[PDB]
Structure 1
Amino acid sequence: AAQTNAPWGLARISSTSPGTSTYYYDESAGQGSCVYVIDTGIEASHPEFEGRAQMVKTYYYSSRDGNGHGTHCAGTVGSRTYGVAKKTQLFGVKVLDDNGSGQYSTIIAGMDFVASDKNNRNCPKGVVASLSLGGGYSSSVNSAAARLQSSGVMVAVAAGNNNADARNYSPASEPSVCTVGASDRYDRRSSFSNYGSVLDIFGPGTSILSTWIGGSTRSISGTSMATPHVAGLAAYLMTLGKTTAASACRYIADTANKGDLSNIPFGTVNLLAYNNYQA
């Protein structure tokens, strides 16, 4: 399949070169997989989700996305126009308040929620979780993300927007999950992107167009926006039967565009997510 005039990040993940604007992908498009977006919530009524998104858990007075962040990320995972996996199912977990912050204990309880709730859903092609959030180092936030991965869910988490080593952040520093940096349209590391040996992959993160609350759209930047590109890709690759939840981050890194990014500090991987689709 081919989507003309796609957002630059979608076109990049199916190209060996920057500067294109068409996204190519197998038409299975993630059918039969599920992605949890653990964030500020999802505006499920957005016409871009086509009835494939819904809220399943909130820790606040409303499960509504009064912020926009959670909606933006969920659109990069699986909205018809801005999504990687255009036929996957989206499950919203609201662990951040409408100001975009949340306690660590609420974030941990959301992660344990998904590790059990996938047993209440139909996902015969596999389960992905996208965690567009983070803060300071916490061994108990790291361990919650390890448990979720171990339960059979591919976990993708943001490196962080501090322009520092991601070792001092959680759950970016958990080694068994998939830590995602951010790149821009000229194949440069985003100026805000964290780095380090803990990073596993880079995704498109600067000026990413996607859904917004009120049925709108806008373009924002962050390792929070590279993370749903990889999360959607994993759901796409598991539908095609090319990998499982336990080895999706490893598979994505093996099949990635190698040595194409600039301003990657020594000791950090130089890998850009790539769907390897031959139309």
Structure 2
Amino acid sequence: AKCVSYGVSQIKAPALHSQGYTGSNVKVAVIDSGIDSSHPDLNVAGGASFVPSETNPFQDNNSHGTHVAGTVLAVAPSASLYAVKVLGADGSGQYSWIINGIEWAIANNMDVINMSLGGPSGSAALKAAVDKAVASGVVVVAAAGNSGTSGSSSTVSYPAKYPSVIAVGAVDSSNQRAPWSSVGPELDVMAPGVSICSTLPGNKYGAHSGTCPASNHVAGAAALILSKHPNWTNTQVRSSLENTATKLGDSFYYGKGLINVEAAAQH
């Protein structure tokens, strides 16, 4: 009935909020199912739809992208979020649609791309677009995936699996890896992703679990770091997050560990 996720204080975002840094001026493309801009606790700054049968990026039929927007804004309240819709009612999107989203983010000078989406395969064209975004200076963050462990295999999804992307896995309030959080050498950092409370369509709130909400926290944290260091490059934003993370378990399962946006914004 109007929650804030425990994850905001777990990544130490409050420490930036009290310095007066809240993501002001940072363009964040939420590449997802869209965002219910009808929600009174959300500011959407604009958007576009690359789903051919669904022209409206501000209608969230699946309720995923609205949750994403909320979690990004809980970390970075004055961030400018753009609803970039590449996922249909079925919850999946063609590579051509997702690539259209990424090309859009580059053309409209997004500072941060959040991709709370995955699949088990890549494409040369997908990797090309993600790399091109990071070359042009965009911080690209993506959910590591919800495939759990599978012996010695990487279970990290594309595009999080690409080295040009910040792959984000999910811990709970105890910094324990969620059993469904994907794993592998491509896993970069962890953030809260268990029962994360946020905005849902129709002026509602509720908890989602997944690496999607984990990655939402990191995209938020990037917007908080660029609030404070507006002249930092994506390389510097990414190093700050990785080099100041709180170490947890092995890097196969946890990567660098829990992000600490407080320590990151001092680096």
Tell me how large the CA RMSD over aligned residues is.
2.2
**Hey, what does 2:170 align to over in structure 1?**
182
Distance across 2 between alignment mates of 1:76 and 1:272: 16
Distance across 2 between alignment mates of 1:267 and 1:14: 22
Where in structure 2 are the equivalents of 1:1-279 lying within 5 Å?
A: 6-14=4-12, 23-24=14-15, 25=17, 26-49=19-42, 51-60=43-52, 61-63=54-56, 64-78=59-73, 83-118=74-109, 127-140=111-124, 141-164=126-149, 165-166=153-154, 169-241=157-229, 243-259=232-248, 262=249, 264=250, 266=252, 269-276=255-262
Supply the AA of the counterpart residue of 1:255.
T
Change (3 A) 1:34 1:265: closer
- Give the number of the structure whose residues are more often strand, by fraction: 1
**Hey, what does 1:121 align to over in structure 2?**
none
CA contact (8 A) 1:202 1:273 kept: yes
CA contact (8 A) 1:42 1:54 kept: no
Change (3 A) 1:231 1:10: same
Once the two structures are superposed, residues 17-52 of structure 1 have per-residue CA deviations (whole angstroms, 9 ceiling, x without a partner) of: xxxxxx443322111111110000011121111x44
Distance across 2 between alignment mates of 1:177 and 1:88: 21
- Give the number of the structure whose residues are more often helix, by fraction: 2
Distance across 2 between alignment mates of 1:142 and 1:74: 25
Deviates more, 1:161-170 or 1:150-159: 161-170
SS of the counterpart of 2:198? strand
Once the two structures are superposed, residues 81-135 of structure 1 have per-residue CA deviations (whole angstroms, 9 ceiling, x without a partner) of: xx110111000100001221111221122111111122xxxxxxx7101000010
CA contact (8 A) 1:201 1:253 kept: yes
Q: Percent identity?
A: 36
Distance across 1 between alignment mates of 2:22 and 2:186: 29
CA contact (8 A) 1:159 1:195 kept: yes
Supply the AA of the counterpart residue of 1:245.
N
TM-score by length of 1: 0.83
Distance across 1 between alignment mates of 2:251 and 2:222: 26
TM-score by length of 2: 0.87
Change (3 A) 1:276 1:57: same
Once the two structures are superposed, residues 156-202 of structure 1 have per-residue CA deviations (whole angstroms, 9 ceiling, x without a partner) of: 01100001344663112100111111111111001100111111111
Aligned length: 252
